[PDB]
Amino acid sequence: PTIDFTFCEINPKKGFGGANGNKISLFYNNELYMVKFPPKPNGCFSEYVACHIVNSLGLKVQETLLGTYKNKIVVACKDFTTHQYELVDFLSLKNTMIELEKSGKDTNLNDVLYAIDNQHFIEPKVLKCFFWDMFVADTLLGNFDRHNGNWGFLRAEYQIAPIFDCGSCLYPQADDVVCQKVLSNIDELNARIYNFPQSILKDDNDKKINYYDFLTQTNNKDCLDALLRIYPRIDMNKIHSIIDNTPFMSEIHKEFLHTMLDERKSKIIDVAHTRAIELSL
């Protein structure tokens, strides 16, 4: 039916960072979880769905289960910093890049790129391939916050940590009234495709990078390679199924995402991929 975490054993000797909603440690089927709570003045859903799409993409993602916790809908992310594994995020790494007078929190794309090539945790080709793999995923999903504290490495010395924190994908602000507006108006819809959301990663002019523009204009062989690579792993029939099998989501929402994913896939990915394909030899 639907999971319920309410009674599972909490682990009180563990906490989690991040500035959106609380989270606690707890066992489920003999495994530990980080259980994100929603904030309130709907990213629990983005987090579950987005990740499951990333999985279907053959990329290493955190396991995610919708469930209830004391009358609050909750996303449970399997915990990958157990068994004596520690997470160091990219931020902390970029902070070692002292020859750039810019701080690790900074998301200017070129610097981020530079640090990848200059870091010594992971073979820079592996790391660079991952990064763009992730950027494509993020493109499809509309991740508006893949900052340097939203990916990283596990140490026991290092390996890439599974993609996490996709709570910022797929329109977390959208509610049934918004889903409604957009679905009934191509103009609105378009604004949520070309203009916004934008990547948290910046150009050398300090603007957030535009998903559509960037991807349909890049000559970065690394970004282009990763398109040609992930494009085939994309399976709309599955992605829609992930959406259909989302546990609490209203129906109106469910079809907002259906539409939105088809559109993103078609007006950004398809297009960019198609050009990507055309640049060979």
Next chain:
Amino acid sequence: PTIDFTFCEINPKKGFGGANGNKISLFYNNELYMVKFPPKPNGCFSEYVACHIVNSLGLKVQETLLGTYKNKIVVACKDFTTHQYELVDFLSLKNTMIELEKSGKDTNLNDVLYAIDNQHFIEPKVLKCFFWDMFVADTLLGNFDRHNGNWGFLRAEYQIAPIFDCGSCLYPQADDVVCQKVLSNIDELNARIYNFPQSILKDDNDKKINYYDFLTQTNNKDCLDALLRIYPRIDMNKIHSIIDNTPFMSEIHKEFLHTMLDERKSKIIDVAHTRAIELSL
């Protein structure tokens, strides 16, 4: 004489967090330090000086060393997450307090206290005494950024992590031109006491807490117990010693502190401490 870190062996497999500038892991004297660089739109001094003052108050603090790399002036912090020790900040810990539907990054004082009473990493009373300890030293050093991410615990389970990131203390935005301006204009010296810095922490109404006002009107026995506890360790000669003995510091700057420290010492600490005593009986 003075220390050049410039040629010391760097550890290309550890990084560090924080928004304010780069840092790298290197061996000095056979040991890891975290070496913090200055951002360039002065804090390396604040850190060094502030930690040596904290130490002299008898509190457990990171050891600081002031050196040069490549003509940079840089502060070295003895790394305390070597030997399997993993640092975990209060913020994550506060993030688990799901009952207050506020996040683990918000610095509302009451919420913070609640988390102290209700967390299972440290015996609560001990931590309530630490927090308060630190608050007092911050009052002395004038810390405007003691955020839940700026203190925490250590584990291989928990012990309190030595006070770190005190680099936001002791007027870091002030330069030789500012020091002069303050050193002359009394009205200017006044407000860097009665007006700011203010603590990052907050009251129920959202406003940040005024060091002076709070310190001299509060009936929180735990804050006051802290005052009485700490006051007798304030060694004004040793402190001015610490200022005179600072390695690259300019003299106008050296004295800006001397002044500024006497000022906070007598204008807040003394006054508040006096009221404390009289408080019993």
